[PDB]
A paper describes a structure:
Crystal structures of a natively glycosylated HIV-1 soluble Env trimer derived from the clade A BG505 strain (BG505 SOSIP.664) complexed with the antibody IOMA, revealed that this CD4bs bNAb exhibits distinct properties from VRC01-class bNAbs. In common with VRC01-class bNAbs, IOMA is derived from the VH1–2 immunoglobulin heavy chain (HC) gene segment, and it binds Env with a similar overall pose as other VH1–2–derived CD4bs bNAbs, but it is not as potent or broad as many of the VRC01-class antibodies. However, unlike VRC01-class bNAbs, IOMA includes a normal-length (8 residues) CDRL3 (34) and is less mutated with 9.5% HC and 7% light chain (LC) nucleotide mutations to its iGL compared to VRC01 with 30% HC and 19% LC nucleotide mutations. In addition, IOMA accommodates the N276gp120 glycan, a roadblock for raising VRC01-class bNAbs, using a relatively easy-to-achieve mechanism involving a short helical CDRL1, and four amino acid changes (including a single mutated glycine) that each require single nucleotide substitutions.
To create the IOMA iGL antibody, we reverted the HC and LC sequences of mature IOMA to their presumptive germline sequences. The IOMA iGL HC sequence was based on human IGHV1–2*02, IGHD3–22*01 and IGHJ6*02 and contained 22 amino acid changes compared to the HC of IOMA, all within the V gene. The CDRH3 was unaltered due to uncertainty with respect to D gene alignment and potential P and N nucleotides – the IOMA iGL HC sequence maintains one gp120-contacting residue (W100F; Kabat numbering) found in mature IOMA. The sequence of the IOMA iGL LC was derived from human IGLV2–23*02 and IGLJ2*01 containing 16 amino acid changes compared with mature IOMA, including 3 SHMs in CDRL3. Of the 3 mutations in CDRL3, two non-contact amino acids (V96, A97; Kabat numbering) at the V-J junction were left as in mature IOMA. No currently available germline-targeting CD4bs immunogens bind IOMA iGL with detectable affinity, and IOMA iGL does not neutralize primary HIV-1 strains. To aid in determining which immunogen residues should be varied to achieve IOMA iGL binding, we solved a 2.07 Å crystal structure of IOMA iGL Fab, which was nearly identical (root mean square deviation, RMSD, of 0.64 Å for 209 Cα atoms) to the mature IOMA Fab structure complexed with BG505 Env trimer. Based on modeling the IOMA iGL Fab structure into the mature IOMA Fab-Env structure, we varied 7 positions in 426c.TM4 gp120. Since the CDRL1 of IOMA iGL was already in a helical conformation, the CDRL1 of the IOMA precursor cells selected by priming and boosting with IGT2 and IGT1 might have been in a conformation that allowed it to accommodate the N276gp120 glycan and therefore not required additional SHMs to accommodate the N276gp120 glycan introduced in the third immunization using 426c.
Numbering used by the authors:
A (entry chain H): 1 to 52, 52A, 53 to 82, 82A, 82B, 82C, 83 to 96, 101 to 226
B (entry chain L): 3 to 9, 11 to 27, 27A, 27B, 27C, 28 to 208
The structure:
Amino acid sequence: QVQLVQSGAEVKKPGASVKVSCKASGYTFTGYYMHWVRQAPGQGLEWMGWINPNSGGTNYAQKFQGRVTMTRDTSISTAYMELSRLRSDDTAVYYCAREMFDSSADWSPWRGMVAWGQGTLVTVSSASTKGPSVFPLAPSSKSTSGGTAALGCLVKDYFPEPVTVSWNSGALTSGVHTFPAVLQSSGLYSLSSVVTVPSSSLGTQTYICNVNHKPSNTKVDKRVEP
Amino acid sequence: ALTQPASVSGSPGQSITISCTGTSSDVGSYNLVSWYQQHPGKAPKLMIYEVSKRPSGVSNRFSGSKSGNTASLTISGLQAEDEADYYCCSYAGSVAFGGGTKLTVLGQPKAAPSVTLFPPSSEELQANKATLVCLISDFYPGAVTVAWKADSSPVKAGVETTTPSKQSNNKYAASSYLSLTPEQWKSHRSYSCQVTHEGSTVEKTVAP
């Protein structure tokens, strides 16, 4: 299995710079070109350039020449993209993507991108960064079920997207629904995550939501009890 | 820099074709058109490369061709899971994407919302705040109306509601939040979240 794992979301003020990493595994890192592609929220894909992890040569889209530098550390199979003099229309999900065939094949790196990182959201804003407040949502059997109950976590009043929520440190995945956030009139976001569990497990199994808001460097592990 | 329609629709089982037009310097001169499929909240997925070749494991319902300066993605026997955005791409001295095509599959049956309403937590009350949480899932089409009541009277202040958003099963989800003071929450008999979808209404009520 080929895998591209990117660094976590960031927030920046206008004029600063951001550096995103991409750790590759499952293949010979120096044999395939690495591209970087971004996507503003609700908009299309925009190529930024590529690096050859062998030799380290680069090629950049005209739009970003003189603002962007791509590098790699072959000793840890990691590519980097740094974008400077940031502006608010640089707000976007930044992806790394590996070329289709290796660099011996004719027409690499112009054929296509088979393997994609999970994406890194970077928000460029001059507004204040705010961390979430996390409140437990105690189990309720009223909706749902046949012998089940729904419980959750309310994640309130955080600014830059995104927030991630896992349950029991990733050991609980079936029945988890994390809802898209609302943007409130205050300019802050709020979301909820709910998991449906067996009712008979309530007195014996502990449920914890793991809330991660990387833009404020905040993690909350909130136990949800009856 | 390439031109494709912003949104197309077809019916299940039928075939549909999405066009991607460049110039004679790119699409017209090279056999280096690729196509990508992107579901909500996921990375793009490479569906076609070199105009007409399919990566391993991509369904043979997807095919590609080119004529003059226009490349074409064709999907046979459309299914509900084919709803997504589709991007074309071509060498052009650089990597050049089209603007993207949103594909909708008509004929999907109505699905009624499932509603969960949570009262404010004891922890939040101790922090001198109160939030009611109305979570709405599995509805289609993606249009919903949400209305809150304190006892029997309407409440419009402190209400925040998302636009419907597509989930993985092609049905939609939405959230509404009612912010109150602790004093307000404890001074009424009940509060209700009332969800209306395609003329039918679900109301859930909680009380202190």
